[PDB]
Amino acid sequence: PLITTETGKKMHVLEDGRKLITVIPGDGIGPECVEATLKVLEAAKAPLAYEVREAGASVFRRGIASGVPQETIESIRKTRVVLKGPLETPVGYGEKSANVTLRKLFETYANVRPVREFPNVPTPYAGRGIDLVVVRENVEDLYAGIEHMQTPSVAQTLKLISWKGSEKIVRFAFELARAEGRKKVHCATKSNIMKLAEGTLKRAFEQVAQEYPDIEAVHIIVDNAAHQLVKRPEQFEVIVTTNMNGDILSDLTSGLIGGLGFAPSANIGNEVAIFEAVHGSAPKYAGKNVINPTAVLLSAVMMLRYLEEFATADLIENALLYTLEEGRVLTGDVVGYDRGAKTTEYTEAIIQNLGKTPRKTQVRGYKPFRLPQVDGAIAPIVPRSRRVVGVDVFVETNLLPEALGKALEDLAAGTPFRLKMISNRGTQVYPPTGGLTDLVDHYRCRFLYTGEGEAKDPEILDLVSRVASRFRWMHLEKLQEFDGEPGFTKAQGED
Amino acid sequence: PLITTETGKKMHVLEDGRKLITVIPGDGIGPECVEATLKVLEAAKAPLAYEVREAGASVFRRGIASGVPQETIESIRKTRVVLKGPLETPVGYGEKSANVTLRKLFETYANVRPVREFPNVPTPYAGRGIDLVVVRENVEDLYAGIEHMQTPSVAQTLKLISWKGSEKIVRFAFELARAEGRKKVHCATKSNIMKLAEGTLKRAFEQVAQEYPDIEAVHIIVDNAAHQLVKRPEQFEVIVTTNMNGDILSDLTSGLIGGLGFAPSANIGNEVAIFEAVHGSAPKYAGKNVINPTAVLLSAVMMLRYLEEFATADLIENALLYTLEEGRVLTGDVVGYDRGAKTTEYTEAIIQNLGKTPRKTQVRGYKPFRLPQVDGAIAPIVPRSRRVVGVDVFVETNLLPEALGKALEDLAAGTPFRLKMISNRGTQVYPPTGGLTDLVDHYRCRFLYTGEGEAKDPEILDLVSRVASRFRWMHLEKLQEFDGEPGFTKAQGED
Numbered sequence: 008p009l010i011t012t013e014t015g016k017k018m019h020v021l022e023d024g025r026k027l028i029t030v031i032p033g034d035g036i037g038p039e040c041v042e043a044t045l046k047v048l049e050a051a052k053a054p055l056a057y058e059v060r061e062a063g064a065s066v067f068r069r070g071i072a073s074g075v076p077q078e079t080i081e082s083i084r085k086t087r088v089v090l091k092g093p094l095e096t097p098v099g100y101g102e103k104s105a106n107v108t109l110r111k112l113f114e115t116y117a118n119v120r121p122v123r124e125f126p127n128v129p130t131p132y133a134g135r136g137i138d139l140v141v142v143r144e145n146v147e148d149l150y151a152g153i154e155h156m157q158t159p160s161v162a163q164t165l166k167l168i169s170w171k172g173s174e175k176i177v178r179f180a181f182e183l184a185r186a187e188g189r190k191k192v193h194c195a196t197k198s199n200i201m202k203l204a205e206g207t208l209k210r211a212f213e214q215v216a217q218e219y220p221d222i223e224a225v226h227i228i229v230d231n232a233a234h235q236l237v238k239r240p241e242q243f244e245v246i247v248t249t250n251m252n253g254d255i256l257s258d259l260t261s262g263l264i265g266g267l268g269f270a271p272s273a274n275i276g277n278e279v280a281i282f283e284a285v286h287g288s289a290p291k292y293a294g295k296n297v298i299n300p301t302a303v304l305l306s307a308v309m310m311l312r313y314l315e316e317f318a319t320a321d322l323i324e325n326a327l328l329y330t331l332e333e334g335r336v337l338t339g340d341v342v343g344y345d346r347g348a349k350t351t352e353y354t355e356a357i358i359q360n361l362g363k364t365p366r367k368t369q370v371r372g373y374k375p376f377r378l379p380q381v382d383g384a385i386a387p388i389v390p391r392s393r394r395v396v397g398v399d400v401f402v403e404t405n406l407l408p409e410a411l412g413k414a415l416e417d418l419a420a421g422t423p424f425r426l427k428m429i430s431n432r433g434t435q436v437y438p439p440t441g442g443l444t445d446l447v448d449h450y451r452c453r454f455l456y457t458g459e460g461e462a463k464d465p466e467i468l469d470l471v472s473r474v475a476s477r478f479r480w481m482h483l484e485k486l487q488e489f490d491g492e493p494g495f496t497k498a499q500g501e502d
Numbered sequence: 503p504l505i506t507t508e509t510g511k512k513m514h515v516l517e518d519g520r521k522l523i524t525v526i527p528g529d530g531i532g533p534e535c536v537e538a539t540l541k542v543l544e545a546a547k548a549p550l551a552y553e554v555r556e557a558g559a560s561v562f563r564r565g566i567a568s569g570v571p572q573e574t575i576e577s578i579r580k581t582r583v584v585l586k587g588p589l590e591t592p593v594g595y596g597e598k599s600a601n602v603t604l605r606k607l608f609e610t611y612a613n614v615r616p617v618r619e620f621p622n623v624p625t626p627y628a629g630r631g632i633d634l635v636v637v638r639e640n641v642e643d644l645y646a647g648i649e650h651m652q653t654p655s656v657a658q659t660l661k662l663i664s665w666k667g668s669e670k671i672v673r674f675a676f677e678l679a680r681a682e683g684r685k686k687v688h689c690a691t692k693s694n695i696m697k698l699a700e701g702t703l704k705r706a707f708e709q710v711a712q713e714y715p716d717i718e719a720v721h722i723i724v725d726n727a728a729h730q731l732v733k734r735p736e737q738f739e740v741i742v743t744t745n746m747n748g749d750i751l752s753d754l755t756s757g758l759i760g761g762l763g764f765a766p767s768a769n770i771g772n773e774v775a776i777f778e779a780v781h782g783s784a785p786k787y788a789g790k791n792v793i794n795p796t797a798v799l800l801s802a803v804m805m806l807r808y809l810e811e812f813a814t815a816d817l818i819e820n821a822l823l824y825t826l827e828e829g830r831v832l833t834g835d836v837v838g839y840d841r842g843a844k845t846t847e848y849t850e851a852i853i854q855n856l857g858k859t860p861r862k863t864q865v866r867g868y869k870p871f872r873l874p875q876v877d878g879a880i881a882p883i884v885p886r887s888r889r890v891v892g893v894d895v896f897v898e899t900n901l902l903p904e905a906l907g908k909a910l911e912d913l914a915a916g917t918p919f920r921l922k923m924i925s926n927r928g929t930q931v932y933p934p935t936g937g938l939t940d941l942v943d944h945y946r947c948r949f950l951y952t953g954e955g956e957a958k959d960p961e962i963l964d965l966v967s968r969v970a971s972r973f974r975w976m977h978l979e980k981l982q983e984f985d986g987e988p989g990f991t992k993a994q995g996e997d
């Protein structure tokens with residue numbers, strides 16, 4: 008049956024004591040990396056039972072667009088613990104990422120990506136003591152993939168950041184820092200540009216920080232953060248950032264200690280945990296028996312510790328590290344593909360080293376920590392007052408700014424709305440600015456309410472119908488104020 | 503008077519042959535870096551006339567929210583050439599970036615950020631021959647700053663990518679490659695997740711590439727790209743990417759050769775050119791005469807060559823390089839702020855070296871190239887057919903998915919629309935998926951047209967008014983098909 012440990016984690020413990028997990032082979036190199044891992048697990052006599060289910064490209068090919076079949080959802084709800092190989096996501100077309108789907112379907116909001124130097128895995132940073140962890144928000148931001156072609160030639164993607172999601176991820180980061188003996192957490196954002204969206208993470212970071220006076224909270228702008236991560240990565244311990252930023256920074260850090268073949272990760276939520284490598288399906292290596300399975304193996308190790316199977320975790324992790332320390336069986340990504348050991352040979356070596364322990368690089372098994380509960384989360388605040396002050400109407404037209412401006416002022420005449428300004432790609436173009444801005448066939452037209460109280464729905468739709476009598480609109484955004492503060496930004500160049 | 507050179511570039515040439523430029527001191531370290539640069543210029547007898555104007559924080563403090571005063575716009579329209587120090591943008595609140603405003607006001611669509619190893623500027627990558635250039639799209643994507651609080655606790659930023667802007671940036675990259683003798687261009691995108699937005703750059707890249715058979719065009723996913731830039735940066739020559747991706751990758755590359763103190767840049771457009779360092783106003787070093795002015799100096803050098811003042815550019819750049827080669831006067835970012843030379847001393851040393859022989863005469867290899875014209879650009883295609891097939895209605899509510907679904911189906915009864923599904927943060931929650939997705943108070947409700955032809959505006963507004971009779975909507979998106987293909991995506995978990 009499924010049980011809840013004292014740490015609050017959910018896991019399926021079989022009568023014989025073994026823990027049942029869902030295993031997803033994946034696409035490309037996936038199966039090879041997972042196959043290798045399962046062999047090492049069995050050799051180490053890991054107390055596990057396996058429910059193999061599919062996800063990714065193989066499922067897209069069955070005509071299931073989400074790439075996550077019902078049997079796999081059923082299995083994950085049964086086990087609450089998953090070890091998956093990479094899943095292939097078509098580039099530029101096709102189905103949405105099944106990797107993102109798994110995380111969002113099961114609220115595994117935290118993506119933990121630790122990086123450390125490895126024995127006989129040389130990098131220009133060897134000896135600097137790089138030991139940091141990137142805590143990537145895992146379920147919102149841009150990667151949700153909510154897109155709409157505003158016009159035939161203008162595409163739009165929504166970036167959504169919530170207080171709820173930001174509060175969760177920053178709290179997780181602090182708890183993680185406090186659980187690994189780290190006394191500092193960096194929050195990387197682009198809040199100087201996205202004051203509302205990225206600023207939500209910055210503000211959640213600052214408010215939750217007050218509860219962890221034992222940890223130093225430092226905010227850093229994401230670009231300078233990338234620069235610092237390359238120039239002096241040893242200054243970082245824990246870095247928490249939004250989904251997209253985290254995707255790039257975590258891959259940046261992996262290149263500091265050997266590459267993606269050595270980057271494991273854990274997708275953690277309160278109800279489910281998904282362990283997988285940070286790397287992809289890597290189609291050019293699939294089936295060639297040359298791929299490095301270290302990343303997936305180390306992920307299984309993270310899974311073992313999560314499962315409280317610390318002994319097996321140390322055993323497997325020691326074997327791997329011992330194998331690296333000796334430096335006799337190294338994969339192509341470390342010694343070139345003209346010399347690199349085969350995947351199966353690498354596996355066999357590690358297995359042959361089960362029971363052996365490295366002298367230098369050893370297992371740094373931190374202490375488990377209870378995940379923050381919803382009842383202790385900082386709930387979003389309900390404004391004391393709020394009002395709809397206008398509406399942004401997006402239109403598709405090639406009419407020049409000045410003419411569009413006069414046309415809309417005429418259409419709004421008689422309504423309780425006035426055209427305040429018009430922007431193109433976010434740049435004010437009406438009133439004119441004296442600039443030389445090039446224009447696309449998409450314009451955002453800001454109308455402000457001029458009456459008493461607030462703009463009511465009927466009035467807004469009436470304004471939109473008037474605009475529609477001549478122009479094609481495709482996107483509407485209400486402009487609201489919450490506690491006297493506008494819940495929207497000005498255009499670039501707008502005074 | 504303002505003239506057009508035989509290369510297409512516009513510059514203000516005075517009666518005496520001097521080229522008039524607009525100079526913006528900036529904020530924080532800005533003034534110090536600019537001040538120094540001007541000193542070196544005057545010493546090198548650069549044939550320039552300066553029109554000093556302000557932008558940035560000092561202007562925000564005058565109550566001009568755009569941070570770009572009219573006199574500065576007037577000056578830029580007059581000179582078409584600008585040398586600016588960094589500008590401070592408030593973090594998480596306040597005014598929008600004046601740096602982004604200048605670029606968008608004057609359509610300086612390409613941000614060229616060259617990176618190379620410098621003498622006596624130690625990095626773990628020294629000797630690997632890193633010599634690449636990031637071509638960052640400069641006027642669209644997320645950095646436009648178009649934001650709306652969908653609900654009091656859910657923020658939204660629009661990511662807009664146009665065919666026009668993407669076509670221009672990739673063509674620029676190819677021309678730049680062909681002009682610097684580079685035989686390869688990498689296009690980094692996240693097209694696997696954002697098939698419409700990021701995919702626009704990918705598709706523009708591939709179609710424009712057909713015009714440059716002499717150049718090898720390679721697409722790479724942005725995350726793997728960061729990994730590769732850290733693991734093996736010497737493989738890259740030219741990298742072209744969207745605005746935000748480029749912001750991060752360019753700073754990542756700067757940390758490979760000395761840090762932001764050595765990263766110059768050029769904001770290029772057809773009508774205007776703005777030269778500035780990649781770094782910011784760096785408030786903690788402001789006024790302490792310790793900041794490294796190299797980045798701004800080299801930007802002035804890029805400016806000089808733009809102005810066709812090649813002799814002065816070589817003179818100044820050789821002096822700088824000679825100074826670094828001698829390694830007698832190095833700034834704090836190179837040898838530590840405990841032994842680093844003062845900004846004024848570093849400057850003095852360079853001026854003293856005006857005329858020396860840099861042993862490794864690595865005056866960068868550059869060849870002027872004509873900017874692509876609009877008449878030669880691939881225009882966006884006008885669909886043969888198009889139709890509105892539905893509407894996405896975003897509502898603010900905490901009513902559970904199941905009940906929200908039933909409520910909306912009831913409201914749509916009688917209309918030529920049906921509720922297809924409902925998502926939360928991009929994840930399908932209605933119909934139920936069997937997942938354990940956490941919900942925020944923002945839901946996207948997809949309605950599909952069920953009649954013949956297409957959904958007309960009056961019918962759409964009628965549906966919205968019915969939804970409004972019970973729920974608060976704040977965001978509408980029409981769903982359109984162009985040439986038989988949906989101009990929108992499915993939700994995560996939606997089959």
Ligand SMILES: NC(=O)c1ccc[n+]([C@@H]2O[C@H](COP(=O)([O-])OP(=O)(O)OC[C@H]3O[C@@H](n4cnc5c(N)ncnc54)[C@H](OP(=O)(O)O)[C@@H]3O)[C@@H](O)[C@H]2O)c1
Pocket residue numbers: 036040092093094095096097098106266267268283284285286287288289290298299300301302340694722723726
């Ligand atoms: N969580 C996931 O399941 C996940 C994460 C990322 C990408 N993907 C998917 O993967 C497909 C390919 O994407 P991609 O080519 O950009 O990236 P990728 O699969 O991570 O491959 C990029 C490069 O990383 C190196 N690498 C990755 N895994 C390695 C391993 N196990 N051992 C040794 N080297 C390894 C290789 O470098 P060299 O080429 O330099 O040898 C490789 O070509 C897509 O559909 C993508 O969406 C899935």
Ligand SMILES: NC(=O)c1ccc[n+]([C@@H]2O[C@H](COP(=O)([O-])OP(=O)(O)OC[C@H]3O[C@@H](n4cnc5c(N)ncnc54)[C@H](OP(=O)(O)O)[C@@H]3O)[C@@H](O)[C@H]2O)c1
Pocket residue numbers: 199227228231531587588589590591592593601761762763778779780781782783784785793794795796797835
């Ligand atoms: N184009 C622009 O005008 C521009 C570009 C970026 C940021 N900004 C603005 O700048 C303000 C501060 O932002 P930030 O602190 O994130 O970044 P930043 O000003 O670039 O400073 C980050 C770090 O870069 C190093 N650095 C930058 N310029 C340097 C130079 N000339 N010489 C030596 N080292 C240098 C320093 O590293 P250490 O601390 O390690 O010494 C510095 O603290 C904000 O308002 C931001 O929006 C403006």
